[PDB]
Design a protein around this ligand. Structure first.
Ligand code: ZN
Lengths: 191, 287, 85, 94, 74, 286, 70
């Protein structure tokens, strides 16, 4: 199977507590963690997946482990109130990826951005060239309400990698009512 | 096949885990394992030492837990250096650290798996400070009864290892077993700082505090022990003035001297602490 | 489930070996006290740091360590037959 | 304030500064002993007041400077004298 | 709420160590029982017990370990 | 709370040998591990420890993580083999703690009620007894600010018990021991004195440098009270300090009087007996 | 270094030392003694004190390991 370590990032920003995604984004992104942890389980047994809180202070409560049980426990009562913070959210998972015992696993990060961010374009392009030097491939899936047809995030994924690098894909929520399972139905079949 | 004089390069961390794992089990004998790397036949090194848990079967070949070895080596893989296992060791705090019947009963298993698997024993009891103590053992091959039992060549470390000849019951194991030499490799920087670490005892705690604590007491209440020292003056020297007259009666030395020598000269060395540290007051009080 | 682990943590106190009974016979210095085992060997050991010899006295039923044989704990009075008569 | 100590004062100093009668300077200084700012004792023969210790309050960069002067003097004191001590016995050590 | 089975696993592993270290009955012995606690002269807690042996010896031990003062008088 | 800690040479080396572990691969940052303490009483003692791989980004200088599975099952390993050992905190090699080291203790406060972090030093240079000890405590402030954690310094001392004494006491093989009464006290007069000179010198150099550069605060708070504590005692005579002078002279009377007494006794015995056995051996043989 | 050796022999040994039931001194530097467990022994005595305080009948503290005459 493919060798890599996937680090899932839940969105704890205060804008993620609304029930626009049925029944609530808390359970919606919980099912999103359910489908990414079960797919990586069906992908390779050697994949270890932790969680990271992006907004406010960034702390990983569950050390990187192949078992998602403790991750599912932290999905409940997470108290996702705070202001979204982007620039640190990728690097905090990058440090968790440098603590891996085995060096044969590729560095992989999946994050959810459900809130408008104040991150400047200079900061995301500095992280883009930094990830170019660090080879890390990040697959982001945009939830929630944000700038219509997100650009700085799309340009972030574009300028993140190149040639090929097969790759970083960005999935933005369509402007219409839908279930969270329908939003994650596309990435699970094809990245 | 080929046999040559052997030398065990040890790390201070190995010896620390040795005596630490042996001190926590006193009197009961514990069971550890030796960790290191085999470079060649005539030289060997132990770069790490870890301890095995104590079980109900006591010290036995079954006491080694396989799932403990799998999880430890996994914890060594996430540790900086995951070196392969080499040999075993067990402490003997209660006696002269000689191999028992169970020690060889696990030795044919450690020589089965591992080619060498040098057995080491350590005890705290023998010397509190100035001796290596510990021990060394290696099982000679019983299949060598055909050929001769008396190697090695370059007898330097061999003839120097045999001495003292280590008693009788220990060198009673010299039949079917033989010791191995141990030297301390530097690593001088850590050896020097850890040298000063224990020197904090007799020098001072911080190299400042304890003799600034000698500036705390500083004759205090240190004259009380001078009053007991001057009571040792009166006591010892009132029978010291009876000695030279008796020397004239018995004509002369009975060999002797009673000693009844030196002593309070050291009290006068504390008087050097009196004059010096009190002369510091002129520096302390003025500016 | 939790009470079973409490009995497990109970057993985490039981690996510590029990000391040896002793009778303090007399004393010599603050580090040396005449003591004998129930089987007859006489020793002189040091005490622990909590006690005063007023808590010991000569001719006192006590206990010693299993290695250092140091004076640690004690009880003044014991016997088998008394109450069972 | 005084370099002192020279920590023994007189009744004229307290009674003139505090402009209070000589009978109330007892209550004055001894209440300060109860406040805890000074542990000193009062000599009532000449009616003198002997202070002990002091209560530090505030004190300035000029004081950090003179503090380096009081320090560096202690530095060269111990350095000189102690380097003279073992200057004598450095030979015999070897 | 799912850690009860994990605690059941740690009490099965440690009671497996109670299967290897009970610690096994082998040598026959006899008892002497008492209750004690240590004030000083800081404050601590505990209890002690006494024992006989098959070799005639006697020992001073913190309270058993494994079964308790439940039974019996010696 | 925690007053003083006893740091054995075993735990210090257990950090430094791991500084060889990740030091051969380098590069930056520090060696961080979990500290295994032993608490018999208010005085804290340390016996063993273990180190965990740790990395800290600078970007993001506040990001830190440890392996809890390593802390969990190895604690299950070390508690198994030794039931007396438990984790009292963590440690790092410093040399000076960055502001991010607080949250590490706040994460492991679930393991131990009070976690004491021990800064250590792998390369001995200055000024004295190595390492350091900081206890996690909330002191708030006299300024009534929202409660923040500034770790209070715990005095650290080096000690051992039995076997840990055996190893190092044989490993010295360096300087005379002690020797009691002659070189010991006077070399300590050099070290404690001179290292006390450059201590407060460089520390008073920081006193003025912090006022020159680094403001704010900086100065306030403790500056005015601490510096006045320096101005507590100048402290010279007159008067009673003059009485202490010749009283101290009256103190040296007895000891030097006794010195002359030992001189007469040592000279009497040794000289008389030696000349006896000397003149006798010469007149009998010659 | 000889003063250091004096610190060794004065540190040697124990603390704690088992006292034993002494019978007689057979000849130079050695003697026979029963322990407090009642078994006669043959041991070379401690060097610095040969005789004066040993006496025919006393109770001599015997080395922990060796049961040496001290
Ligand atoms: Zn054995």
């Amino acid at each position: 199977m493919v060798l890599e370590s996937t680090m899932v990032c839940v969105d704890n920003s205060e804008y993620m507590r609304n029930g626009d995604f049925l029944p609530t984004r808390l359970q919606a992104q919980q099912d999103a963690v359910n489908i990414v942890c079960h797919s990586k389980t069906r992908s390779n047994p050697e994949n270890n997946v932790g969680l990271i809180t992006l907004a406010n202070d960034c702390e990983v409560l569950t050390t990187l482990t192949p078992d998602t049980g403790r991750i599912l426990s932290k999905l409940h009562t997470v108290q996702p109130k705070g202001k979204i913070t982007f620039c640190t959210g990728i690097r905090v998972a990058h440090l968790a990826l440098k603590h891996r015992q085995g060096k044969n696993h590729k560095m992989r990060i999946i994050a959810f951005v459900g809130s408008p961010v104040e991150d400047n374009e200079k900061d995301l392009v500095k992280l883009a060239k930094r990830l170019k030097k660090e080879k890390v491939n990040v697959d982001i899936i945009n939830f929630g309400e944000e700038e219509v047809n997100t650009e700085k995030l799309t340009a972030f994924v574009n300028t993140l990698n190149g040639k090929d690098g097969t790759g970083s894909h960005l999935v933005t929520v369509p402007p219409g009512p839908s279930l969270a399972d329908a939003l994650i139905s596309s990435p699970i079949l094809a990245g | 096949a080929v046999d040559t004089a052997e030398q065990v390069y040890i790390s201070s961390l190995a010896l620390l885990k040795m005596l630490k794992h042996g001190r926590a089990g006193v009197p009961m004998e514990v069971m550890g394992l030796m960790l290191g790397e085999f470079v060649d036949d005539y030289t060997v090194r132990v770069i790490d030492v870890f301890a095995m848990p104590q079980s109900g079967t006591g010290v036995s070949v079954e006491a080694v837990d396989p799932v403990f070895q799998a999880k430890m080596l996994d914890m060594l893989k996430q540790t900086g250096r995951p070196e392969m296992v080499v040999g075993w060791y067990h402490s003997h705090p209660g006696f002269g650290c000689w191999l028992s019947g169970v020690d060889i009963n696990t030795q044919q298993s450690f020589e089965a798996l591992s080619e060498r698997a040098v057995a080491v024993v350590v005890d705290p009891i023998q010397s509190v400070k100035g001796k290596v103590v510990i021990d060394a053992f290696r099982l000679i091959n019983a299949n060598m009864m055909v050929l001769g039992h008396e190697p090695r060549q370059t007898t330097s470390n061999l003839g120097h290892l045999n001495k003292p000849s280590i008693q009788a019951l220990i060198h009673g194991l010299n039949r079917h077993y033989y010791s191995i030499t141990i030297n301390y490799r530097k690593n001088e920087l850590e050896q020097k700082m850890l040298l000063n670490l224990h020197k904090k005892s007799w020098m001072e705690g911080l190299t400042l505090q304890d003799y600034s604590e000698h500036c705390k007491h500083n004759e205090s209440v240190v004259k009380e022990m001078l009053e007991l020292a001057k009571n040792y003056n009166k006591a010892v020297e009132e029978e010291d003035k009876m000695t030279p007259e008796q020397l004239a009666i018995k004509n002369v030395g009975k060999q002797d001297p009673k000693r009844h020598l030196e002593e309070h000269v050291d009290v006068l060395m504390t008087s050097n602490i009196v004059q010096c540290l009190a002369a510091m007051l002129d520096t302390v009080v003025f500016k | 489930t939790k009470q079973y682990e409490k009995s497990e943590n109970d057993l985490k106190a039981l690996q510590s070996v029990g000391q040896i009974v002793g009778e303090v016979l007399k004393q010599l210095t603050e580090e040396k006290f005449i003591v004998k085992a129930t089987n007859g060997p006489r020793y002189v050991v040091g005490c622990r740091r909590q006690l005063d010899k007023s808590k010991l006295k000569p001719g006192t039923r006590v206990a010693l360590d299993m290695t250092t044989l140091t004076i640690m704990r004690y009880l003044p009075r014991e016997v088998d037959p008394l109450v069972y008569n | 304030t005084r370099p002192a100590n020279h920590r023994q004062l007189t009744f004229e100093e307290i009674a003139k500064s505090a402009k209070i009668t000589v009978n109330e300077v007892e209550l004055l200084v001894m209440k300060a002993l109860s406040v805890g700012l000074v542990k000193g004792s009062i000599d009532e023969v000449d009616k003198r007041v002997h202070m002990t210790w002091v209560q530090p309050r505030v004190l300035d960069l000029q004081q950090i400077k003179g503090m380096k002067d009081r320090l560096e003097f202690w530095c060269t004191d111990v350095k000189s004298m102690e380097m003279l001590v073992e200057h004598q016995a450095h030979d015999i050590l070897t | 709420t799912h850690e009860l089975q994990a605690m059941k696993d740690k009490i099965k592993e440690n009671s497996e160590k109670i299967k290897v270290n009970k610690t096994l009955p082998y040598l026959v012995s006899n008892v002497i029982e008492l209750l004690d606690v240590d004030p000083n002269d800081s404050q601590r807690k505990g209890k002690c017990a006494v024992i006989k042996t098959s070799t005639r010896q006697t020992y001073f031990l913190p309270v058993i370990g494994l079964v308790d003062a439940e039974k019996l008088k010696p | 709370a925690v007053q003083k800690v006893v740091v054995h040479p075993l735990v210090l080396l257990s950090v430094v040998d791991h500084f060889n572990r990740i030091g051969k691969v380098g590069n930056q940052k520090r060696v961080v591990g979990v500290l295994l303490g032993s608490w018999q009483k208010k005085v804290l003692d340390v016996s063993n420890s273990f180190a965990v791989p740790f990395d800290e980004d600078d970007k993001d200088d506040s990001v830190w993580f440890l392996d809890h599975d390593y802390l969990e099952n190895m604690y299950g390993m070390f508690k198994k083999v030794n039931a007396r050992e438990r984790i009292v905190g963590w440690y790092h090699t410093g040399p000076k703690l960055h502001k991010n080291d607080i949250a590490i203790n706040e994460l492991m406060k679930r393991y131990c009620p009070n976690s004491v972090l021990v800064i250590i030093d792998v390369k001995p240079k200055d000024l004295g007894l190595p390492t350091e000890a900081y206890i996690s405590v909330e002191e708030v402030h006299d300024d009534g600010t929202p409660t923040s954690k500034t770790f209070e310094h715990v005095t650290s001392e080096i000690g051992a018990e039995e076997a840990e004494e055996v190893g190092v006491e044989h490993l010295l093989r360096d300087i005379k021991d002690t020797t009691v009464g002659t070189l010991s006290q006077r070399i300590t007069n050099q070290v404690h004195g001179l290292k006390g000179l450059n201590s407060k010198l460089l520390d008073i150099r920081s006193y003025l440098e912090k006022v020159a550069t680094g403001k704010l605060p900086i100065n306030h708070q403790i500056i005015y009270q601490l510096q006045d504590v320096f101005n507590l005692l100048p402290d010279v005579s007159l008067q009673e300090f003059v009485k202490a002078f010749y009283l101290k002279t009256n103190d040296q009377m007895v000891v030097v009087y006794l010195a002359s007494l030992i001189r007469s006794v040592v000279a009497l015995h040794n000289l008389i007996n030696n000349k006896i056995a000397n003149r006798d051996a010469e007149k009998k043989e010659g | 270094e000889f003063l250091h050796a004096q610190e060794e022999v004065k540190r040697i040994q124990s603390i704690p030392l088992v006292i034993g039931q002494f019978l007689e001194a057979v000849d130079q530097n050695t003697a026979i003694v029963g322990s407090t467990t009642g078994s006669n022994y043959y041991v070379r005595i401690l060097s610095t004190i040969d005789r004066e305080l040993l006496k025919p009948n006393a109770s001599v503290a015997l080395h922990k390991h060796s049961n040496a005459l001290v």
